């Protein structure tokens with residue numbers, strides 16, 4: 001449970017994280033390397049935002065952002081040799097620390113000519129984040145929120161990745177609680193005002209199972225189906241929530257009141 005002043009620090013950090021995604025958007029084009037995208041992000045964070053990437057060095061992570069293409073579910077490592085191409089779907093997952101507090105958000109970019117199925121998976125995944133956000137208010141259990149995401153996603157013939165989840169966030173990067181995106185008999189966390197955490201559903205076109213690669217980081221779908229993710233950092237309010245990482249292109253308001 002964060003203090004008013006700490007919540008303010010989270011607004012600042014969350015805005016910065018959102019702004020990295022706004023900044024990078026025009027660079028997300030056929031032909032660019034994920035390596036360069038990462039350099040551009042890191043330069044912006046250090047030099048213009050006077051912040052730091054939370055990811056760089058975190059538990060040994062080598063880069064400043066995670067960039068995940070098509071069948072890669074999460075933790076794609078920027079690389080100078082990996083070029084974006086027409087029809088790709090790409091997640092850029094950003095976390096910045098500013099004044100001791102973390103802001104954590106990601107979105108999908110569609111590269112070149114969108115494919116109908118890429119467009120669909122991306123839209124449905126964002127909608128699954130959106131429906132979750134509209135549920136958030138004190139007195140609700142996280143279990144219900146995980147359950148609703150799962151129900152929505154699967155009704156689309158998609159699946160929810162189980163190995164990854166949203167999380168409490170503040171002066172730490174991945175704090176309690178775990179925010180599962182599916183119904184779990186383990187989840188029992190009733191929301192309270194001032195809690196800050198993320199919601200970050202990872203949705204596969206095919207089966208839920210994943211595979212980790214040999215670089216200690218990159219995760220793909222076991223069946224090599226497409227996978228998409230969107231993420232926001234939020235604070236629970238008296239009556240709902242406030243999205244700390246909102247972007248210009250978000251089709252949901254910052255403050256959600258009940």
Ligand SMILES: CS(=O)(=O)Nc1cccc2cccnc12
Pocket residue numbers: 054055056058059061066075093095164174
């Ligand atoms: C820093 S990171 O964005 O690459 N993410 C992570 C790093 C290290 C450990 C993690 C565990 C769960 C989820 N994300 C993790």
Ligand SMILES: [Mn+2]
Pocket residue numbers: 075
């Ligand atoms: Mn991560």
Ligand SMILES: [Mn+2]
Pocket residue numbers: 093094095104105106200231
């Ligand atoms: Mn993230």
Ligand SMILES: [Mn+2]
Pocket residue numbers: 104166167198200231
């Ligand atoms: Mn996160």
Ligand code: NA
Pocket residue numbers: 068069070071072073074089091226227228
């Ligand atoms: Na993907």
